[PDB]
């Protein structure tokens, strides 16, 4: 009834009722058998007298097509299309708007209505008598193809056939709309129609029928290149000569379009423009200077040439030497352009070159004088844009070359001064000048600005007082660096800085005491005043106490809290011993209160400030504020955050070093928190060193209840009374060793007690572990030759049921020998040969000795260790060979000049074991961080890596492993050997059925392969090469062996699926070409079936194999423009049809 009342009111002869009925009908449509009424009512209101009702009717067509039967959409579209050709302009326009609205609301990717629209649009465009209908139809078709180009793939030839003849019509608007429509068509067209259009364009260009049409065709080619890009690359070899020929025609408008086409080609198809950059650059350089009416509308060609040069420079890194050879002088010489826009374009091109430059640097340094001479003339001009560009170039040039402008400061400063104090200058120009001055001052020696300080100070001081606050902030930023330059604290400067101190202080203090200015100026003023006090605070008079009181006042505000803390830190640590004592008493409690403000940066800053203030001003320390700061530490010493804990421990160490009388107050929560942190499994790096230093400092003080024995018992109580992590034992042992070396007079008793504890048979395994680790740590730095039974006890502890105690005994034997090398190392060397029963542990001890000994102290025994290791290389028991190989490799690092060639010598002559031994020992000299051995390895590793060709089975595997380690850790030493090692690596991926052996027992089959390890290592090397260096190997030989791998063993199958998934992202173009060959092994693996006489393990294994295979399949499927493939589409259809594959596909979803 409501819908009937609405339709009754929609013909009420009153505009208000019609408007309201249409409005609430539209609101409601946000019924069956009555849609035929509402549709006709809306299409009739489309011709109403009032405009508001027409607008409402047009907006109501949107939500109507989504709530009506598909049949009535056809009649709506038909009525709109037939009204678009009517004889009334208002109906035509309103119908065009309605049709655009209808097209917009249709869901993309619906097909019938698009075909119905196209059938009439083609005829409308084909007409050549009503231009307005042509323009409307072109707009409608552009809107249609913009979002629904995927559909109606069968109408593309007709659309092309109707569009192409319109590029000749007299009116240019038709041509422009046709170009837009053609671009949108090419965006999603087919292969044949694209070729037809390109051939038509080339044929029409070759004919050159009229001057007017040639511009249109060139514009069309440029638009096609912009829209498609990668689909036109295979036609530049024919396109470019035509535009090159047309560039020589004496028409100003034609040249600009050709240069724009060149720019589009350079930007959008980088792969296919490589052979033509040399001629595009030459044309652009020829037409930069084009001006036939001035001798020193022709500026458009110069603008286009500058834009094209900018585009060429911005996207070619490898042509930097050629750029600096040929295009830089022209750009420098064109800085004197008569016109502003062309000058700006030239400037922008040169900035683009400068950013690309980030040897090119040497050539830029050679070119600098010409740049300076050119900019000197441009820095004195009425225009502000030219000066802004000059300052931007100066800033970029200084940012690229730090010290480029050393010899040109005398000619550069007057321009900056002139721009700073000019009444006809904008805020942007002043900010740019100040930024350039700041950058110049930061990146140059202080001695070059000394003659120019007298000229620099007044304009900067005036700029500090500018009403606009941005200029004030920039002026303060410049002033801080000027203060640093005027009096360095790290160099012996002879400059006299007295006269300007008063000016700088006066200009900064007024900004400092403002209380109403913006926050940025507040922080900048605080920083500038801090720098002033730090650098030149000795020459100030009585203003220092007042300034420090202001600093105190700024410490209690949230906006400016961190900045003043950093300023106080800067002031405290200065060679000029400033007196902060009047501030310290009232300032320490506030800084202590900052420690509870749940902000990390504030905590770190206030901890640093407290540390420096305690260190430098200990004479005026008071117990009250020390207690105040000590009251908030315990919450900070925790394993959740380790940096704050390290800062707190450093503060405690400084307090113990400078104020030892206040350590009686750390016997409660602080010490408990420290001890608990000692047992944390996350203790490493700086925190451990800080803890050791704090313990060493605390022992020497002599406070009660904190002696050596008290700390030792508090450290070792939990172990003896009853630790769930192994790192806790190491940390406790390190702390005990630090305590022992702090006070050496009590060392022997503790060492003897530890020896008795490890010797005793009533002690648990936890006690023996800690005792051995503590003995090893103590013996590292303290000589322990006075203990006679130490070696006997340790060697007895070698034979124990537990593995942890055995490892601890080996580590302790290794660590003790470092303290007294001559007394202990011969003993270990003799014991390795004497007792065959215990050699896997003595070799580990020797490894520890080698890894943790001084270079100077291990030189004499190098020959003995080398002889023993090379004697023991040929050993039957594997595992004993790995440790000796590691020992040899780590010994190579000590004196690598002479040991490395001796290692290489065994490759030519030796047994099978020796070659594998040396190749394995090579890999232990490679680390991520740079090492002194790197220059030798880069030259020598070719001899080791040419062992990939070897009759021995194991040596090839060892060489592959070494190559993998080198690729993963330091790829810079294998990149140049890729061209000679890749074929051998690829050869190792073959099956080599000679080594395959099969063993039979009844109807059951078992296979054993002796080449599986080598194939796995080769595929691992390939995976590493993917991430390490993908731009130095062929991407087409790689895929062949990847395809070989997809039918290989289960582990290789998983690895190859992973590599395929990774390669779906990197260089997807190569995968798309090979996609036909890739899916066949995937489909074979996914559809295979196991025998019925098998246990559930094989079924499960095949299940995850299938899941991983179709995960790789989906990864391949996600590649753009890959669904339109024969094998891929067949596989998708088969997966959809087959329930077994569909279920597992849904499983990975």
Binding mask 786-825 for another protein (x = CB under 8 A): -----------------x----------------------
CB of 1113 within 8 A of CB of 1131? yes
Select from 31, 74, 1051, 1123 the one that contacts another protein (CB under 8 A): 1051
Site residues (CB under 8 A) for another protein, limited to 885-924: 923
Kindly state whether residue 492 participates in binding another protein, applying the rule CB under 8 A: no
Q: Which residues contact 1000 (CB under 8 A, 6 or more apart)?
A: 1006
Q: Which residues contact 716 (CB under 8 A, 6 or more apart)?
A: 732, 736, 770
For the chain, the helix, strand and coil percentages under 3-state DSSP, each to the nearest 5: 75, 0, 25
Kindly state whether residue 49 participates in binding another protein, applying the rule CB under 8 A: yes
Kindly state whether residue 356 participates in binding another protein, applying the rule CB under 8 A: no
Q: What distance lies between CA 402 and its chain's CA centroid?
A: 25
**Residue number, 1096 or 1124, with CB nearest to another protein:** 1096
Half-sphere CA count of 1128, side-chain side, radius 13 A: 21
CB of 521 within 8 A of CB of 466? no
Site residues (CB under 8 A) for another protein, limited to 91-110: 93-94, 97, 100
Kindly state whether residue 1001 participates in binding another protein, applying the rule CB under 8 A: yes
- In the complex, the smallest distance separating the C-beta of residue 447 from another protein, rounded to whole angstroms, is 30
Select from 1010, 1104, 1123, 1130 the one that contacts another protein (CB under 8 A): 1104
- In the complex, the smallest distance separating the C-beta of residue 555 from another protein, rounded to whole angstroms, is 22
Q: How many residues are listed for the chain in this entry?
A: 1149
Kindly state whether residue 986 participates in binding another protein, applying the rule CB under 8 A: no
Q: What is the DSSP string of 420-475?
A: HT-TT--HHHHHHHHHHHHHHHHTS-GGGSGGGHHHHHHHHHHHHT-SSHHHHHHH
Select from 479, 508, 569, 964 the one that contacts another protein (CB under 8 A): 964
Select from 721, 1069, 1097, 1137 the one that contacts another protein (CB under 8 A): 1097
Kindly state whether residue 1013 participates in binding another protein, applying the rule CB under 8 A: yes
Choices 387-395, 479-487, 767-775, 1011-1019 (CB under 8 A): range interacting with another protein: 1011-1019
CA–CA separation, 707 vs 717, rounded Å? 15
SS3 letters for 144-186? HHHHCCCCCCCCHHHHHHHHHHHHHCCCHHHHHHHHHHHHHHH
Select from 928, 994, 1121, 1146 the one that contacts another protein (CB under 8 A): 928
Instruction: Provide the H-helix boundaries in 852-933.
Output: 855-858, 862-872, 880-893, 896-908, 912-922
- Tally of CB atoms within 10 A around 49: 8
Site residues (CB under 8 A) for another protein, limited to 643-702: 643, 681-682, 684-686
CB of 569 within 8 A of CB of 604? no
Select from 4, 785, 882, 1088 the one that contacts another protein (CB under 8 A): 882
Which run of H or of E encompasses 984? helix 978-987
By the 10 Å C-beta count (0-12 exposed, 13-18 middle, 19+ buried), 487 is classed as buried
Kindly state whether residue 1000 participates in binding another protein, applying the rule CB under 8 A: yes
- In the complex, the smallest distance separating the C-beta of residue 426 from another protein, rounded to whole angstroms, is 7
Which run of H or of E encompasses 997? strand 997-1001
Binding mask 850-879 for another protein (x = CB under 8 A): ----------------------------xx
Kindly state whether residue 426 participates in binding another protein, applying the rule CB under 8 A: yes
Kindly state whether residue 835 participates in binding another protein, applying the rule CB under 8 A: no
Binding mask 609-648 for another protein (x = CB under 8 A): ---------------------------------xx-----
Rg (CA), the chain: 41
Binding mask 695-734 for another protein (x = CB under 8 A): ----------------------------------------
Kindly state whether residue 342 participates in binding another protein, applying the rule CB under 8 A: no
Select from 170, 1003, 1120, 1139 the one that contacts another protein (CB under 8 A): 1003
595 three-class SS? helix
Select from 341, 365, 370, 428 the one that contacts another protein (CB under 8 A): 428
- Tally of CB atoms within 10 A around 773: 26
Choices 49-57, 151-159, 236-244, 755-763 (CB under 8 A): range interacting with another protein: 49-57
Q: Which two tokens stand for residue 722?
A: 């009853």
Choices 80-88, 311-319, 662-670, 994-1002 (CB under 8 A): range interacting with another protein: 994-1002
Q: What distance lies between CA 620 and its chain's CA centroid?
A: 49
CB of 639 within 8 A of CB of 674? no
Kindly state whether residue 598 participates in binding another protein, applying the rule CB under 8 A: no
Choices 311-319, 425-433, 658-666, 901-909 (CB under 8 A): range interacting with another protein: 425-433
- In the complex, the smallest distance separating the C-beta of residue 262 from another protein, rounded to whole angstroms, is 16
The dihedral over CA atoms of 230, 236, 239, 242, expressed in degrees to the nearest 10, equals 140
- In the complex, the smallest distance separating the C-beta of residue 470 from another protein, rounded to whole angstroms, is 7
- In the complex, the smallest distance separating the C-beta of residue 14 from another protein, rounded to whole angstroms, is 6
Kindly state whether residue 173 participates in binding another protein, applying the rule CB under 8 A: yes
Choices 46-54, 369-377, 388-396, 944-952 (CB under 8 A): range interacting with another protein: 46-54
Select from 353, 417, 644, 961 the one that contacts another protein (CB under 8 A): 961
Kindly state whether residue 1002 participates in binding another protein, applying the rule CB under 8 A: yes
Q: What is the DSSP string of 1037-1085?
A: HHHHHHHHHTTS-HHHHHHHHHHHHHHTTSSHHHHHHTHHHHHHHHHHH
**Residue number, 100 or 768, with CB nearest to another protein:** 100
**Residue number, 928 or 1031, with CB nearest to another protein:** 928
Distances (CA, A) of 304 to 252, 253, 265, 285: 11, 11, 14, 11
Select from 679, 1108, 1125, 1128 the one that contacts another protein (CB under 8 A): 1108
Choices 183-191, 487-495, 509-517, 998-1006 (CB under 8 A): range interacting with another protein: 998-1006
Kindly state whether residue 24 participates in binding another protein, applying the rule CB under 8 A: yes
**Of 202, 100, 183, which is closest to residue 144 (Cα–Cα)?**
100
Residue 1007, phi then psi, degrees to nearest 5: -115, 140
Instruction: Provide the H-helix boundaries in 269-298.
Output: 277-288
Select from 3, 7, 15, 870 the one that contacts another protein (CB under 8 A): 15
Greatest Cα-to-Cα distance within the chain, rounded to the nearest angstrom: 121
Which run of H or of E encompasses 405? none
CA–CA separation, 57 vs 48, rounded Å? 9
**Residue number, 517 or 658, with CB nearest to another protein:** 517
CA–CA separation, 906 vs 676, rounded Å? 53
228 three-class SS? coil
Q: Which two tokens stand for residue 969?
A: 């850790």
Select from 330, 409, 991, 1058 the one that contacts another protein (CB under 8 A): 1058
CB of 907 within 8 A of CB of 947? yes
Kindly state whether residue 172 participates in binding another protein, applying the rule CB under 8 A: yes
Number of residues that bind another protein (CB under 8 A): 80
By the 10 Å C-beta count (0-12 exposed, 13-18 middle, 19+ buried), 879 is classed as exposed
**Residue number, 343 or 881, with CB nearest to another protein:** 881
Site residues (CB under 8 A) for another protein, limited to 400-419: none
Binding mask 139-158 for another protein (x = CB under 8 A): x-------------------
Select from 168, 1107, 1119, 1134 the one that contacts another protein (CB under 8 A): 1107
Kindly state whether residue 20 participates in binding another protein, applying the rule CB under 8 A: yes
């Amino acid at each position: 009834y409501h819908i009937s009342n609405l339709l009754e009111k929609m013909t009420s002869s009153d505009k208000d009722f019609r408007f309201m009925a249409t409005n609430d009908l539209m609101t409601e449509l946000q019924d069956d058998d009555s849609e035929r009424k509402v549709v006709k009512m809306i299409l009739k209101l489309l011709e109403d007298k009032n405009g508001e009702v027409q607008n409402l009717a047009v907006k109501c067509l949107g939500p109507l097509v989504s709530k009506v039967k598909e049949y009535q959409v056809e009649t709506i579209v038909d009525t709109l299309c037939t009204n678009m050709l009517s004889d009334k302009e208002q109906l035509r326009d309103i119908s065009s708007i309605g049709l655009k609205t209808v097209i917009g609301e249709l869901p993309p990717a619906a097909a019938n209505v698009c075909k119905k629209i196209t059938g009439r649009l083609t005829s409308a465009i084909a007409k050549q008598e009503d231009v307005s209908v042509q323009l409307e139809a072109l707009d409608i078709m552009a809107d249609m193809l913009s979002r629904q180009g995927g559909l109606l793939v069968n109408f593309h030839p007709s659309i092309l056939t109707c569009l192409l003849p319109q590029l000749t019509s007299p009116r240019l608007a038709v041509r422009k709309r046709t170009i837009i429509a053609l671009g949108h068509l090419v965006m999603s067209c087919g292969n044949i129609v694209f070729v037809d259009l390109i051939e038509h364009l080339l044929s029409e260009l070759s004919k050159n029928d009229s001057m007017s049409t040639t511009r249109t065709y060139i514009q069309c080619i440029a638009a096609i290149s912009r829209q498609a890009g990668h689909r036109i690359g295979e036609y530049l070899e024919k396109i470019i000569p035509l535009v090159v020929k047309f560039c020589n025609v004496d028409d100003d408008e034609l040249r600009e379009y050709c240069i724009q086409a060149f720019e589009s080609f350079v930007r959008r198809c980088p792969k296919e423009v490589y052979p033509h950059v040399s001629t595009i650059i030459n044309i652009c350089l020829k037409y930069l200077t084009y001006d036939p009416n001035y001798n020193y509308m022709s500026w458009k060609v110069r603008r286009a040439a500058a834009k094209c040069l900018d585009a060429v420079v911005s996207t070619r890194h490898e042509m930097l030497p050629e750029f600096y050879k040929t295009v830089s002088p022209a750009l420098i010489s064109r800085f004197k352009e008569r016109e502003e826009n062309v000058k700006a374009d030239v400037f922008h091109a040169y900035l683009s070159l400068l950013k690309q430059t980030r040897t090119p640097l040497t050539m830029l340094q050679s070119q600098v004088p010409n740049i300076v001479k050119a900019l000197h003339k441009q820095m004195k001009e009425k225009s502000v844009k030219t000066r802004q560009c000059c300052f931007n170039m100066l800033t970029e040039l200084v940012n690229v070359l730090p010290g480029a402008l050393t010899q040109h400061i005398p000619v550069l400063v007057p321009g900056i001064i002139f721009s700073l104090n000019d009444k006809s200058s904008s805020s942007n120009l002043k900010i740019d000048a100040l930024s350039c001055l700041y950058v110049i001052l930061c990146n140059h020696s202080p001695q070059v600005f000394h003659p120019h300080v007298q000229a620099l100070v007044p304009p900067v001081v005036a700029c500090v007082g500018d009403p606009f606050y941005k200029i004030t902030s920039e002026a303060l930023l410049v002033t801080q660096q000027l203060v640093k330059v005027i009096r360095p604290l790290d160099q012996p400067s002879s400059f006299d800085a007295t006269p300007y101190i008063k000016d700088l202080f006066t200009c900064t203090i007024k900004r400092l005491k403002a209380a109403d200015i913006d926050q940025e100026v507040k922080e900048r003023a605080i920083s500038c005043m801090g720098q002033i006090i730090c650098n030149l605070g000795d020459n100030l008079g009585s203003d220092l106490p007042n300034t420090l009181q202001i600093f105190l006042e700024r410490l209690k505000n949230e906006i400016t809290r961190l900045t003043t803390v950093k300023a106080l830190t800067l002031i405290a640590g200065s060679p000029l011993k400033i007196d902060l004592r009047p501030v310290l008493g009232e300032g320490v409690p506030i800084l202590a209160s900052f420690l509870r403000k749940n902000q990390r940066a504030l905590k770190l800053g206030t901890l640093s400030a407290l540390d420096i203030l305690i260190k430098n001003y200990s004479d005026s320390l008071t117990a009250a504020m020390i207690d105040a700061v000590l009251d908030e530490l315990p919450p900070l010493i925790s394993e959740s955050d380790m940096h704050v804990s390290q800062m707190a421990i450093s503060f405690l160490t400084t307090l113990a070093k400078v104020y030892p009388s206040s350590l009686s107050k750390i016997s409660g929560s602080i010490l408990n928190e420290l001890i608990g942190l000692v047992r944390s499994p996350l203790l490493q790096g700086g925190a451990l060193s800080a803890m050791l230093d704090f313990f060493q400092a605390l022992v020497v003080t002599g406070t009660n209840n904190l002696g050596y024995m008290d700390l030792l018992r508090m450290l070792t109580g939990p172990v003896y009374s009853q630790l769930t992590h192994k790192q806790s034992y190491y940390s406790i042992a390190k702390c005990v060793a630090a305590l022992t070396r702090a006070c050496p007079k009590e060392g022997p008793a503790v060492v003897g007690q530890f020896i008795q504890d490890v010797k005793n048979s009533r002690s648990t395994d936890s006690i023996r572990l800690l005792a051995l680790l503590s003995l090893g740590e103590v013996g590292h730095h303290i000589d322990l030759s006075g203990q006679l039974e130490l070696k006997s006890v340790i060697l007895e502890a070698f034979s124990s049921p537990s593995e942890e105690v055995k490892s601890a005994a080996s580590y302790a034997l290794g660590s003790i020998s470092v303290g007294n090398l001559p007394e202990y190392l011969p003993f270990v060397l003799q014991e390795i040969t004497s007792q065959p029963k215990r050699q896997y542990l003595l070799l580990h001890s020797l490894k520890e000795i080698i890894s943790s000994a001084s270079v100077v102290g291990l030189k004499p025994y190098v020959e003995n260790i080398w002889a023993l290791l090379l004697k023991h290389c040929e050993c039957a028991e594997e595992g004993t060979r790995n440790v000796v190989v590691e020992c040899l490799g780590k010994l190579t690092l000590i004196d690598p000049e002479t040991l490395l060639p001796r290692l290489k010598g065994y490759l030519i002559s030796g047994s099978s074991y020796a070659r594998s031994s040396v190749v394995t020992a090579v890999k232990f000299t490679i680390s991520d961080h740079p090492q002194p051995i790197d220059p030798l390895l880069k030259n020598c590793i070719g001899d080791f890596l040419k062992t990939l060709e070897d009759p021995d089975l194991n040596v090839r595997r060892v060489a592959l492993v070494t190559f993998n380690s080198a690729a993963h850790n330091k790829p810079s030493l294998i990149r140049d050997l890729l061209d000679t090692v890749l074929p051998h690596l690829y050869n190792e991926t073959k099956v080599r059925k000679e080594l395959i052996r099969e063993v039979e027992m009844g109807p059951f089959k078992h296979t054993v392969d002796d080449g599986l390890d080598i194939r796995k290592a080769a595929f691992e090397c390939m995976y590493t090469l993917l991430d390490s260096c993908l731009d130095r190997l062929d991407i087409f030989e790689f895929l062949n062996h990847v395809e070989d791998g997809l039918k290989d063993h289960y582990d290789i199958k998983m690895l190859t699926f992973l590599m395929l998934v990774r390669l779906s992202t990197l260089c997807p173009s190569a995968v798309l070409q090979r996609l036909d060959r890739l899916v066949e092994p995937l489909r074979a693996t996914c559809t295979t079936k196991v025998k019925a006489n098998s246990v559930k393990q094989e079924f499960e294994k095949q299940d995850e194999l299938k899941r991983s295979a179709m995960r790789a399949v989906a990864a391949l499927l996600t590649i753009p423009e890959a669904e339109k493939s024969p094998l891929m589409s067949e596989f998708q259809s088969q997966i959809s049809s087959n329930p077994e594959l569909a279920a597992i596909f849904e499983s990975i979803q």
